């Protein structure tokens, strides 16, 4: 019941600022020192700074001083981090955390994803990865969908409206030099059934209100 | 500034085995202000140990910590499936406030070797219409994670024009899968015939090549 709940995902242009919030429940908000920590994609944890219980004292990591402002509102029980002059290296998940009396971070928020990029919202193009004898082992064939050139994250991929789950591998997205993301989703299936079973990948990109169903047609040649 | 060095960077162990994770501080840790955290994929970190050896409330007693000065250890006496995650050590001080994290140890599931199944996918005519050709090489259900993928176009080795993506360890069989995507303009793609993906992995007695001729 002791909880920290953070605001939703953010997408920002370089040079902008972002203000993330973190609201407590189940404990006396004003008793505790509070923190922000961030984690860049695939990287480790990096402490950003601390704010004292009253809210009139802060100390920030040397890297962020001059660019970050931490505040708290006792009337709403809410903690804030504002990070200014954003650059693409500020792309990360940002966590709020409670400092216990012993100093370690005993309650954590769920994280807020912040994307900083020049790119504009764009839905993906979905292309088939058709099965063939070049995708067929001893009775097992691989097929998939290439989900290319979208921004921002995330996309979701399902197969046959969720009826096909076994053997599916949906790869993590990779950022291309264009600033757009791309990923592939693959599945291995019995080759004997390629002519009597239909395989459709369902791609949803909520930021662009894009929905794409792509039938992946086998190649007899 | 204090620096926390974690070892090993990756630890491969099977369920039921004992895990020993180490952290070395570059200078003495005042008052044993030292903590260990667990972070599962896509989740926030969770405090395991504080004051270098005190288990946080609700943490299974198979987790324990010890140490002082510059050397600290986290032990998991018997690994359970839920314990395979990233672990971070942390040092902190009050006057002035400072909090430093180790770079993390990935605790990975160690299974038997499994050589990858390799598949190659030519770009679709649909994609070719838009001016780009993506060639996808798939390495499916292999272990361990380390693998080499080399692209050759008309027997010419490619460099700088491919990107790899790897899944997390499969929840059912603890294997990895990997995609390599070769990206070319339609103009370059249609200048060549033979596209080949060569895969090296310790489970393969010799490298596996999957290839196609453009147009078949």
């Amino acid at each position: 019941q002791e909880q920290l709940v953070q605001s939703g995902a953010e997408v920002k242009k370089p040079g902008a600022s972002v203000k993330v919030s973190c609201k407590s429940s189940g404990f006396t908000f004003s008793y505790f020192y509070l923190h922000w920590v961030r984690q860049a994609p695939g990287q480790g944890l990096e402490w950003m700074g601390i704010i004292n219980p009253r809210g009139d004292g802060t100390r920030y990591a040397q890297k962020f001083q001059g660019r970050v402002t931490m505040t708290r509102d006792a009337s709403t029980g809410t903690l804030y981090m504002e990070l200014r002059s954003l650059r693409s290296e500020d792309t990360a998940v940002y966590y709020c955390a409670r400092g216990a009396d012993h100093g370690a971070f005993d309650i954590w928020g769920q994280g807020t994803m912040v994307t900083v990029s020049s790119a504009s919202t764009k839905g993906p193009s979905v292309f088939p990865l058709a099965p063939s004898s070049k995708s067929t082992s001893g009775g097992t064939a691989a097929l998939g969908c290439l989900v290319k050139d979208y921004f921002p994250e995330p996309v979701t991929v399902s197969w046959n409206s969720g009826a096909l789950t076994s053997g599916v591998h949906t790869f993590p997205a990779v950022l291309q030099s264009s600033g757009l993301y791309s990923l592939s989703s693959v599945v291995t299936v019995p080759s004997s059934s390629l002519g009597t079973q239909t395989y459709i990948c369902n791609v949803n990109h909520k930021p662009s209100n894009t929905k794409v169903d792509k039938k992946v047609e086998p190649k007899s040649c | 500034e204090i620096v926390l060095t974690q070892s090993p960077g990756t630890l491969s162990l099977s369920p039921g085995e004992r895990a020993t994770l180490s952290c070395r501080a570059s200078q003495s840790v005042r008052r044993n202000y030292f903590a260990w955290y667990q972070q599962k994929r896509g989740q926030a970190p969770r405090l395991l140990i504080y004051d270098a050896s005190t288990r946080a409330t609700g943490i299974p007693d198979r987790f324990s910590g010890s140490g002082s000065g510059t050397d600290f250890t986290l032990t998991i006496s018997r690994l359970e499936p839920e314990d395979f995650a990233v672990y971070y050590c942390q040092q902190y001080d009050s006057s002035p406030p400072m909090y430093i994290f180790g770079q993390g140890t990935k605790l990975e599931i160690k299974r038997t070797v499994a050589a990858p199944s390799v598949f190659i996918f030519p770009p679709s005519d649909e994609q070719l219409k838009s001016g780009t050709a993506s060639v996808v090489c798939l390495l499916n259900n292999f272990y361990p994670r380390e693998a080499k993928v080399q692209w050759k176009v008309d027997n010419a080795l490619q460099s700088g024009n491919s990107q790899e993506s790897v899944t997390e360890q499969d929840s059912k069989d603890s294997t990895y899968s990997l995609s390599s995507t070769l990206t070319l303009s339609k103009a370059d793609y249609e200048k060549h015939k033979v596209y080949a993906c060569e895969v090296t992995h310790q489970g393969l007695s010799s490298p596996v090549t999957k290839s196609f001729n453009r147009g078949e």
Binding site: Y33, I50, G57, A100 | R31, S94
Partner: peptide, 15 residues
Amino acid sequence: LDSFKEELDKYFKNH
């Protein structure tokens, strides 16, 4: 011994 929080309280009083 002073808790970590008590040492933080001292730091923010004096800084």
